[model samples]
Target: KPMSPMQYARSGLGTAEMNGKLIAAGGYNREECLRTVECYNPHTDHWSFLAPMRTPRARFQMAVLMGQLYVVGGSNGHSDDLSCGEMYDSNIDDWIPVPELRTNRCNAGVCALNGKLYIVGGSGLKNCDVFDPVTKLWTSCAPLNIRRHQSAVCELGGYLYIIGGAESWNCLNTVERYNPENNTWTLIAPMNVARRGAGVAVLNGKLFVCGGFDGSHAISCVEMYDPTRNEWKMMGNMTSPRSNAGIATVGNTIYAVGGFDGNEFLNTVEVYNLESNEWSPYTK
Candidate 1:
């Protein structure tokens, strides 16, 4: 069988593409937070273990900048939030500490733009922060107009977009974009349905948002946003309902990694094809 399964079953894991491989990092499973890390190579259709993070976390965000994976805020599994951050250098195969966020954040939206990292709202916060690798410093940027967490975030057309998430217990359908040049945020076209914990990736200049909670239950619905059109349209549903899944784009394919499905945590992996406009299981 190709597309070997991930060694661990986890939700809230952080994932990013580096050096042509998908890196899966810290997540939660079995009432415990994980520090385990795994890398998947599509060419070989196999997964291999990588050095674990120094800090165990879940419900966090991961971003890639200058060929390095940056693991940002999440919970430490004791019900406590974390402000600390780490960076993974594939060349060294290890993790290095990055400057901490000004405030603790879990379920925050993170994305890299203009060679800097932006950490958006989480939980009750509307606070946004940016990290510059060159200066190795953390500074505040424009905060979100609406406070939220668990939102799907990505960069497209040189702008950072944050899709549906929640404000406290209420799921949101609102979408917002940031202008780094002016350090401001603007509300944009919203998703058709309210969701949180959805996975997002930019493919062929379009932003794709996959499975997430709809307030009642986990959903398999998927949506895509065309920046030029400034609208969202429904797309093919995923094979399973996944909340907090790790989504990444490689070539013409979009990979939806592990997440929670309401009833259980999942380790399954699915891939979406642009030509077929469908999603199919990648790991058994």
Candidate 2:
């Protein structure tokens, strides 16, 4: 099986890259929320730990753009959703608190496009916020028409594509896109099924939606969306279903890591080859 460049655990907590390196991860657990951060270098297949989060946290949403990792709101595993946002600089091994989000939300969808960060469809029916790193300010943008809580997101062709998420007890399949060029969200075709907590990414202009939980089952199904034609289709399923995993593109390969398989947490990682439509078995 092909190996993920991620020697780390959990995807989100594991995925997203800034400055061409794998982003660090932290998650909430019974042992207490983790503040540890680790960066992986795919080019060398090496993992390096960065400065741990000053305040231990988990369930935070983050994005890496322009050499900075923007770590946003989530609970400390024992408290309420956070209000502040923290920025970590790899070069300096430092973290700085930036502007807070317009509203508090956990397990939100966030990505980068056109040199700005776009946060969408989190808890609380909050509007999207676009952060300008150069200006060091956050401005509210159009809200995702979907109003999701745990949707996945990816950026492609200047638009932010949001995938399946939930509201209240309803799992939603609605999809929406954020066009930063105009700061607006236009509804797109929905997914085949409604799912939340999926690991999602966009590669070669194709949006890939992976493992997630529907109401009754954890799913391994892989689906892809093409914005060029506003269409969606199914692909190969993962060897096992994983919810709450992290996903990213390493070179031309797609990788998913550490997620709850059902009853327990997983350490297995899996990779997909777009060229072959094949999913490698779980790996270390």
Candidate 3:
């Protein structure tokens, strides 16, 4: 209900048993995008600024796989656009550029689940691909029914849900479901709001979406997609609305982290308890 002290991301906490070790990477400050990577441990509730990425860029995509953090292409003034990828080894305290993807980097449409990493629709195209960290081979999958970029990606029940993205100049409202077991793509119910950039997380069998931007302005509405009903329902809104923000699920709570809030990019973080339907400002 209250603004979190000075904007900070809340999720990256590995696990309570792991004692609150969090690894935070790329994000822009509202005004200037940043590549300064830092790790936070909840056990200590303190953040240790880690080595910044060799390549300083914002809007690049990231994923946590097998304890290592992976980053992909984002915004760069003149790196020849992208197909670049990098990985961070916490133990080593450095970033290693992994083999780049055959497909160009736009924004992330996929993440790690059940072991493998899935890269769904990015800004470049509506195509989908899966990357095996062990093999380093990228395989193409089915394309989305509608092409989009600047959307949110979440994994649930071994399936990945790609939602709410836009194209060259069009905003999208459709949701696409991809099943890894069969590598098939199926169209699902579209969202109530047609937004370009937003954050989504899968929790308690429901997919929750928050803060995104339309063509002209940023939005504050929060909605959840119920797989069983195949519909999006309104949920509690965020205390502070933002786009390009970060969100992650820690046990029973969902955390919304840094992003641009229309007027300013924030480091503010909020924790929403699924059981309570109430959001509390995270102290750290």
Clash list (residue pairs), candidate 2: 11-14, 11-246, 12-246
lDDT of 1 by residue, 1-284 (tens): 43576888878889888777787898997778999998888777788899999878888888989988888888876754454578887898898876554336688888999999898988756888888888878899998999989999899878999888999899999999999989899999999989989989888999999988999988889999998899999999998899888899865568988898999888878788788888888544
- Of 1 and 2, the candidate ahead on lDDT is 1
Q: Best to worst by lDDT, what's the order?
A: 1, 2, 3
lDDT of 3 by residue, 1-284 (tens): 34323333322111111124444566555244455665544434455676676665656456667867777656544442655677777687787877554335657565787787788776647787778877888778887777878778877888888888887777788888888778788889989888878778767899988878877777767889999999999887777776777766654457676666677666666777666676666553
Model 2, residue 238: displacement in angstroms? 1.5
User: Each candidate's lDDT (Cα)?
Assistant: 0.85, 0.72, 0.67
Scored by Cα lDDT, where does model 2 land? Answer: 0.72
List the lowest-lDDT window of 10 residues for candidate 1: 97-106
Best by TM-score: 1
Write model 2 residue lDDT over 1-284, tens digit each, in one string.
34443333443363576656655577643345667776656566556777777666566567767756777766565564565677787678887766554335677877778888777766636478777877868888877675787788788876788888887778878888777677778878988978888878778889899988887787888889977788989999987788877777766567776676776566565678677898885344
RMSD of each: 1.8, 2.8, 3.7
lDDT measured at residue 28 in model 2 versus the true structure, 0 to 100: 45
The Cα error of candidate 2 at residue 37, in Å, is 2.0
